[PDB]
Design a binder for these strands. Structure first.
Ligand SMILES: [K+]
Ligand SMILES: [K+]
Ligand SMILES: [K+]
Ligand SMILES: [K+]
Ligand SMILES: [K+]
Ligand SMILES: [K+]
Ligand SMILES: [K+]
Ligand SMILES: [Mg+2]
Ligand SMILES: [Mg+2]
Ligand SMILES: [Mg+2]
Ligand SMILES: [Mg+2]
Ligand SMILES: [Mg+2]
Ligand SMILES: [Mg+2]
Ligand SMILES: [Mg+2]
Ligand SMILES: [Mg+2]
Ligand SMILES: [Mg+2]
Lengths: 82, 177, 80, 114
RNA sequence: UGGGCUACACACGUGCUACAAUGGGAAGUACAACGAGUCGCUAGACCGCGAGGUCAUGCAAAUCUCUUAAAGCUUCUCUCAGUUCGGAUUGCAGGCUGCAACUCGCCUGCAUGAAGCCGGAAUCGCUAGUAAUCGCGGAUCAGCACGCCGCGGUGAAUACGUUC
RNA sequence: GCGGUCGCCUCCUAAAAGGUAACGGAGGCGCCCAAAGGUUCCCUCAGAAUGGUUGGAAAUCAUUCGAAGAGUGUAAAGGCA
């Protein structure tokens, strides 16, 4: 995996977006294309609309999801069986 | 005999205090232990029933009663009376010794053991513990066994309520979850 | 109790080899080894791995870290 | 025997131990080295002292039922958060990026010619 | 910018690993060739179980490095077991490259331990340093090959004959 | 004529004794058991609820409820705890 020295990754613009909303009793959807961004503890309680290629699927970030990339919750392919 | 001494000396006064019993006779006691090995596989092969009987006999120290299908069934295939299942009845000293072994050795040897159920009471103060797998008893020898089988151990007591039964069994030693 | 049908049943002392706690009960199993006992008697000795005096559930004492929340895991992994 | 699993009595101690869930060759060698037991001795010939030391060393580890519970808990957590990994676990598809057009038998099951 | 070309009830091509004892594991010891290298090949030392990391050294090279090759040979162990075979799958923890490894890289460690007991009809390559087998290097290439190109090590059986 | 039936047992018809017909309404029999007979002793069921490993509606086990709702070789009626 990613080297420890590098530390966790999150797109700076997305991190700024969450920072601006840290002090919000009622948070608002955070729209992003940055699937690569990791889920930090500060992300909990937010709802991030991750672009899946054609639409922004909302993902509610619970504290259990930290450590995972955002795209892990926005499947890019749709398959309903043959 | 050690468990009997525990019951007579420490358990009895404590139960009397807790349940405000006018007379010592009201103290619940473990009347009997019926250990039943349900063997429906006997129909497919009787040797399985024979080995189950042998194992249960080794566990209990007594020859089991080989029960028979009291009714005829289609999917279980006994023109009434075929020998499916066995049981043993323990009372007195043998019962107390077996219960002591159960609490102190056999149960600890259960794989990933996290106690025993606490809703497994009949509602009249009689408990029943379902052993999934044998080999927890040291007598089984863990190699003569070819098919792992379980059992149902029914502890029948004189308690009138599951509360009293649970108290009695806990005091006698029962790893309730 | 009927004679000659039941398995041989003799007294026996068993020990939790982990802690050495021993005590007496009856069993159909025997051993090529024996030991003395209180009250001044000798019984066959049965070795056991675990008993109520050593099993973790009986003792209550755990043996692991009880897991760690994922937020704590993240902070520990990345020194945050 | 050691962890509630009757290790083969006639195998060398390392091989016998490997039968314990959560113990591999390296782990068995490590525990034997720590205890001070030669690896070539068959388990049947182990003395009670050796067996007790081995039991203590193993108990120091997480093995068998607890290990299975932990791994299953991780998989269940993935499923319940509903990640891509969780969905792969749910539908029995490869979870580590393997191609599924062919192969993937280990997860899919035996081929259904239909 | 993101996703897809990496999908997946299935069908078919080409390969790799296997199904074991002519073998697995452990330890010791020997013999190549073709090629590549400047911000690249990197010595030696130290750290780390390993992937690798740090310091640092020679070399634009018959000079230094990749590069002490693997099969091989000498001992020890294992004893026919779906196993000390197998290495799929999965969990955890890591190393790199890159701004970035979820879709969707490779590699390492611990754990796990899948089908598989030599394969129906049918079908393929090969007449000698060939097949089989064993490694080594290179191109593309930040990183990513069981594929391709090339190199050498060991190294056989068979050909009566042209009816089909 | 063709079809059906012909002997014996049970019920309804059958009109509260008995008996009573129809090509009236329903079923059985042409055996079985060496115990499924006699006696002495002993025992009481069917299901339901709850609890319990394989085991599921339902196999075996335990407790309570349970007067017959079972069983009585073989049809029915009567009778039998
Ligand atoms: K894929
Ligand atoms: K294929
Ligand atoms: K291939
Ligand atoms: K060998
Ligand atoms: K990737
Ligand atoms: K083949
Ligand atoms: K490369
Ligand atoms: Mg193992
Ligand atoms: Mg891939
Ligand atoms: Mg694009
Ligand atoms: Mg393509
Ligand atoms: Mg084989
Ligand atoms: Mg030719
Ligand atoms: Mg009349
Ligand atoms: Mg009249
Ligand atoms: Mg009769």
């Amino acid at each position: 995996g990613r080297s420890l020295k590098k530390g966790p990754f999150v797109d700076d613009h997305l991190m700024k977006k969450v920072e601006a909303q840290q002090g919000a009793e009622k948070k608002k959807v955070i729209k992003t294309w940055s699937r690569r961004s990791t889920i930090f503890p500060s992300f909990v309680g937010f709802t991030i609309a991750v672009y899946d290629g054609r639409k922004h699927v909302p993902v509610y970030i619970q504290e259990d999801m930290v450590g995972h990339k955002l795209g892990e919750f926005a499947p890019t392919r749709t398959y309903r069986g043959h | 005999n050690r468990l009997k001494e525990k019951y007579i000396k420490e358990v009895t006064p404590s139960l009397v205090e807790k349940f405000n019993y006018s007379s010592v006779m009201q103290t619940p006691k473990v009347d009997k232990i019926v250990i039943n090995m349900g063997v429906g596989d006997a129909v497919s092969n009787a040797k399985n029933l024979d080995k189950a009987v042998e194992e249960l006999a080794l566990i209990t120290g007594q020859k089991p009663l080989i029960t028979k299908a009291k009714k005829s069934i289609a999917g279980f295939r006994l023109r009434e009376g075929m020998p499916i299942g066995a049981k043993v009845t323990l009372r007195g000293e043998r019962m107390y010794e077996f219960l002591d072994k159960l609490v102190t050795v056999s149960l600890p040897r259960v794989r990933d053991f996290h106690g025993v159920s606490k809703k497994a009471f009949d509602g009249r103060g009689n408990y029943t513990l379902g052993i999934k797998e044998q080999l927890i008893f040291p007598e089984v020898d863990y190699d003569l066994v070819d098919k792992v089988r379980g059992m149902d151990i029914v502890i029948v007591t004189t308690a009138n309520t599951d509360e009293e039964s649970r108290e009695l069994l806990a005091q006698l030693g029962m790893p309730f979850q | 109790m009927k004679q000659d049908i039941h398995p041989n049943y003799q007294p026996v002392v068993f020990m939790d080899s982990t802690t050495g706690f021993k005590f007496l009960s009856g069993s159909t199993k025997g051993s090529s080894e024996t030991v003395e006992w209180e009250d001044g008697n000798t019984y066959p000795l049965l070795r056991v791995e675990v008993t109520s005096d050593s099993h973790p559930f009986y003792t209550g004492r755990q043996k692991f870290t009880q897991a760690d929340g994922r937020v704590d895991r993240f902070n520990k992994k990345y020194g945050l | 025997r050691i962890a509630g699993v009757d290790i083969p009595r006639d195998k060398r101690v390392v091989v016998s131990l490997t039968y314990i869930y959560g113990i591999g060759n390296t782990t068995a060698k490590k525990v034997l080295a720590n205890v001070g037991v030669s690896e070539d001795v068959r388990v049947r010939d182990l003395t009670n002292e050796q067996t007790d030391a081995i039991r203590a060393e193993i108990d120091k580890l997480k093995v068998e039922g607890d290990l299975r519970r932990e791994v299953n808990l991780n998989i269940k957590r993935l499923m319940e958060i509903g990640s891509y990994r969780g969905i792969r676990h749910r539908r029995g598809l490869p979870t580590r990026g393997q191609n599924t057009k062919n192969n993937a038998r280990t997860r899919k099951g035996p081929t259904k010619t239909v």
